[PDB]
Design an enzyme around this catalytic site. Structure first.
Site, PDB file in Angstrom:
ATOM      1  N   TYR A   1     -16.054  -3.468 -47.641  1.00  0.00           N
ATOM      2  CA  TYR A   1     -15.310  -2.875 -46.563  1.00  0.00           C
ATOM      3  C   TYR A   1     -14.056  -2.152 -47.051  1.00  0.00           C
ATOM      4  CZ  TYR A   1     -13.466  -2.761 -41.711  1.00  0.00           C
ATOM      5  OH  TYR A   1     -12.937  -2.415 -40.466  1.00  0.00           O
TER       6      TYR A   1
ATOM      7  N   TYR B   1     -10.412  10.996 -31.200  1.00  0.00           N
ATOM      8  CA  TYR B   1     -10.540   9.581 -31.578  1.00  0.00           C
ATOM      9  C   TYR B   1      -9.838   9.351 -32.876  1.00  0.00           C
ATOM     10  CZ  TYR B   1     -12.927   5.674 -34.015  1.00  0.00           C
ATOM     11  OH  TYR B   1     -13.192   4.513 -34.731  1.00  0.00           O
TER      12      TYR B   1
ATOM     13  N   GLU C   1     -17.890  -0.503 -31.099  1.00  0.00           N
ATOM     14  CA  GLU C   1     -16.729  -1.356 -31.325  1.00  0.00           C
ATOM     15  C   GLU C   1     -16.829  -2.673 -30.554  1.00  0.00           C
ATOM     16  OE1 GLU C   1     -14.274   0.100 -33.703  1.00  0.00           O
ATOM     17  OE2 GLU C   1     -16.133   1.242 -33.627  1.00  0.00           O
TER      18      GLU C   1
ATOM     19  N   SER D   1     -13.001   1.581 -41.137  1.00  0.00           N
ATOM     20  CA  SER D   1     -14.188   2.144 -41.807  1.00  0.00           C
ATOM     21  C   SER D   1     -14.628   3.553 -41.314  1.00  0.00           C
ATOM     22  CB  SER D   1     -15.360   1.159 -41.749  1.00  0.00           C
ATOM     23  OG  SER D   1     -15.716   0.896 -40.390  1.00  0.00           O
TER      24      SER D   1
END
EC number: 4.3.2.9
Lengths: 169, 169
Positions: B126, B6, B85, B11
């Site tokens: 973020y 992945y 997600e 983040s």
């Protein structure tokens, strides 16, 4: 040794997919929920194959897209990526989960544009998509949505193999 | 197989962040996606109520690059990461990408991007997380400079106690 490919564009038409992928096998018709069909120009550049906008999809709640699922050998992955313009930045490879009409979910590979400017498809591109939907019994309701897509005013010609496919249909 | 690869570019660059929903994720390598540009946006024009600014996404763009972290995960994790997600709610679409390591090795990974979004700057909280993970996971220093140069929004309220706690230290 195989994978499943979800087609919503010109590879709806059996004769069309087989030109570069003759071993593709019809798997079934299916629906991608919450995506919408669009056409456009990758990187703002008009396709010189089709001379109009080319098919793409994006997430859109309430919307749907019908396509045909093809079964292919895993040895054809790079070739299909090559066909769809993946290295040249035209489409990206996606995984989608589609639903057959008997309520079955199928996990497939497909493709979408990430950077395009929306633009209408040429008549011949439209016709190829229309013939494919009819050939493969997509729902009639969906077919009528496709029939209602306004094309651009391209009046020249596409490739002879495409141009000859149309004359047969 | 048991496992998949992945590619995190947002983040989930931060180990502490990724580990809160996917504790068995293991660092694989740092890698480069060519011809892709990083962006921040509101999916479907909705602001992240988690992050309170644009969240991370990528799109094809020749010339540019995106660096990130390849995590190795168990294939039992797949559905979970999708939920994370918001695939089903149309926030991200599953993609396949090929990435190169700094020693030049090509890797096939899973990732995500948004197909329907408005551009919006990320929150300060973020941006920090993303920078924290770029730093911790040995992304190249010139790329860290690029991330550091991201203009955040003006949000100065509370995020979640868990996100605020990661940041403090």
């Amino acid at each position: 040794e195989s994978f499943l490919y979800f087609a919503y564009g010109s590879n709806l038409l059996t004769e069309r997919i087989h030109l570069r992928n003759p071993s593709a096998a019809f798997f079934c018709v299916a629906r991608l929920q919450d995506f919408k069909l669009d056409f456009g120009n990758s990187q703002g550049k008009t396709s010189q194959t089709w001379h109009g906008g080319i098919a793409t999809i994006f997430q859109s709640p309430g919307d749907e897209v019908w396509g045909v699922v093809w079964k292919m050998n895993k040895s054809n992955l790079n070739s299909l990526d090559e066909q769809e313009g993946v290295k040249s930045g035209m489409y990206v490879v996606i995984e989608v989960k589609v639903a057959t009409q008997e309520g079955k979910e199928i996990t497939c590979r497909s493709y979408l544009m990430t950077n395009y400017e929306s633009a209408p498809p040429s008549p011949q591109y439209k016709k190829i998509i229309c013939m494919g939907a009819k050939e493969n019994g997509l729902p009639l309701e969906y077919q009528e949505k496709l029939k209602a897509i306004e094309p651009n005013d391209y009046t020249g010609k596409v490739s002879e193999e495409i141009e000859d496919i149309i004359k047969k249909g």
